[PDB]
């Protein structure tokens, strides 16, 4: 069944949960654009972040696990043949989001997979190195001008390499949903006070 593999596997949020997350992400993009902490550092980044990221996910929001490219991607077949992948296909999950983030290229949500969910994370250089398994897991909320969504995962890894050693620094804002951190280079992270739960289905997208 190699030739019948999807473009990618992942957790695809339901219609209702995709909308709840989309709205939460839009609220963040507008809160952030109007924080003077953010305004100060536009040299490093009025800018309306909602329009800036007006390359929309042409579909439901999702957390990709394995890019397969219909079986041409490296490791596509070994991922998809796993028993846990077959048995999880079509099943319902409630995933945890711990933070929202923005860079000059992407806007996203950080997904904190549990040990059990990591079984669906696929089995590196020096951007995922030293970080826990599955740290790349994210939901893209928007991309800038010419950016493709694969970039969102690389941007989150870069941010998390900072958080690793407390380079996150002191908070520069205390929003009702969490504290706001300026990581420099136009990088921003809202650490949510309480995790967001999103309902999703593990499945595959064929383009």
């Amino acid at each position, epitope marked *: 069944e190699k030739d019948f593999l999807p473009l990618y596997f992942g957790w695809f949020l339901t219609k209702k949960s995709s909308e709840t997350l989309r709205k939460a992400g839009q609220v963040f993009l507008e809160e952030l654009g109007n924080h003077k902490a953010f305004k100060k550092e536009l040299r490093h980044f009025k800018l309306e972040l909602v329009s800036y990221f007006g390359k929309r996910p042409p579909g439901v929001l999702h957390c990709t696990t394995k890019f397969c490219d219909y079986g041409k991607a490296a490791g596509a077949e070994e991922y998809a043949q796993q028993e846990v992948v077959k048995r999880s296909y079509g*099943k319902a*999950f409630k995933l945890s989001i711990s933070a929202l983030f923005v860079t000059p290229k992407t806007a996203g949500a950080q997904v904190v997979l549990t040990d*059990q969910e990591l079984q669906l994370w696929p089995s590196k250089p020096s951007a995922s190195e030293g970080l826990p398994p599955g740290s790349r897991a994210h939901v893209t909320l928007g991309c800038a001008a010419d950016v493709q969504p694969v970039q969102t995962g690389l941007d989150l890894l870069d941010i998390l390499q900072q958080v690793k050693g407390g380079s996150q620094g002191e908070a520069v804002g205390e929003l009702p949903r969490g504290k706001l951190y300026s990581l420099g280079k136009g990088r921003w992270m809202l650490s949510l006070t309480k995790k967001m739960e999103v309902k999703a289905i593990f499945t595959g997208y064929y383009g």
Partner: nanobody
Amino acid sequence: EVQLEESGGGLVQAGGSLTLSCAASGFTFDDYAMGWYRQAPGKERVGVSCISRTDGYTYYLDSVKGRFTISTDHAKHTVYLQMNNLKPDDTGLYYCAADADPEYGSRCPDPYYGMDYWGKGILVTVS
């Protein structure tokens, strides 16, 4: 504020049939999911059957497939579980469940993940 009211359980001889019913009060919209979970002696609660009111899509635990049928009455906001050819292994506390997300709840998610709303449970004893 949603409330789930269960009925239809009790004692039945092996090979018999029961129909469980659960009425949901307090939902403000039609597009939600309802289903049934069972706790057998010594075991954790497990999804038995779930349904999406609008789509009608159904999930069945493999051990009940063919024997149990789930259905809804739209106007009455009630779900029904028709249990035929009952076996002693079907004994347990049966719990109605509902969830506001019809796509999530209609898949009978594991209780690890959960459902938004739960009934109190009704006993089915198959002798």
